[PDB]
């Protein structure tokens, strides 16, 4: 699906492979890795793949294709590097400006429940427990989530 275009230093590939083995749930079939949950590691590898993008980087896999069948990541490694180098992401000030309009008082914060709702429903599909653990701690007494600090913590960590 993707051609070999750019390769980084092999030690970076080596540590990516090490993390994959960490996530490798196949004891004897360690050569093959999860087809669909590799995008979850790509999420964990300092990248932020959107749902549609993390789907068609895999050529529109099916749910059975996503989970049942296996795949060799090293074929996808050039495409993972391509996704990393696309830089199809906004900036921190861009993020805070975008989430600023989602307010009705301009206090520098956003109410928690509507933030969870838009994160789960308005945007890409995400389980709720994920959103409460995302703003776990970021949640305050009156619900006015500090969206600037929250988003800087997110993109930084």
């Amino acid at each position: 699906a993707s051609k070999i275009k750019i390769e980084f230093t092999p030690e970076q590939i080596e540590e990516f492979k090490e993390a994959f083995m960490l996530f490798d749930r196949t004891p004897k079939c360690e050569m093959k890795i999860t087809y669909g949950q590799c995008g979850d590691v790509l999420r964990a590898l300092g990248q932020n793949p959107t749902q549609a993008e993390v789907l068609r980087v895999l050529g529109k896999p099916r749910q059975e294709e996503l989970n049942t069948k296996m795949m060799d990541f090293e074929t996808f490694l050039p495409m993972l590097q391509h996704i990393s180098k696309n830089k199809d992401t906004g900036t921190y000030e861009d993020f805070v400006e975008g989430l600023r309009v989602f307010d009705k008082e301009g206090n520098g914060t956003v109410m928690g429940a509507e933030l969870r709702h838009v994160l789960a429903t308005l945007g890409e599909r995400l389980t709720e427990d994920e959103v409460e653990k995302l703003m776990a701690g970021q949640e305050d007494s009156n619900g006015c989530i500090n969206y600037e600090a929250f988003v800087k913590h997110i993109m930084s960590s």
């Binding site: 008082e105 301009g106 206090n107 520098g108």
Partner: peptide, 30 residues
Amino acid sequence: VGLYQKSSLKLLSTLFANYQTVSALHRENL
């Protein structure tokens, strides 16, 4: 004033966190 309470600076807010003629207050303080 209501604009002041919803300002970006916490300083301006805490000056106008709430809002007694001045002559009577001065006499009482004296």
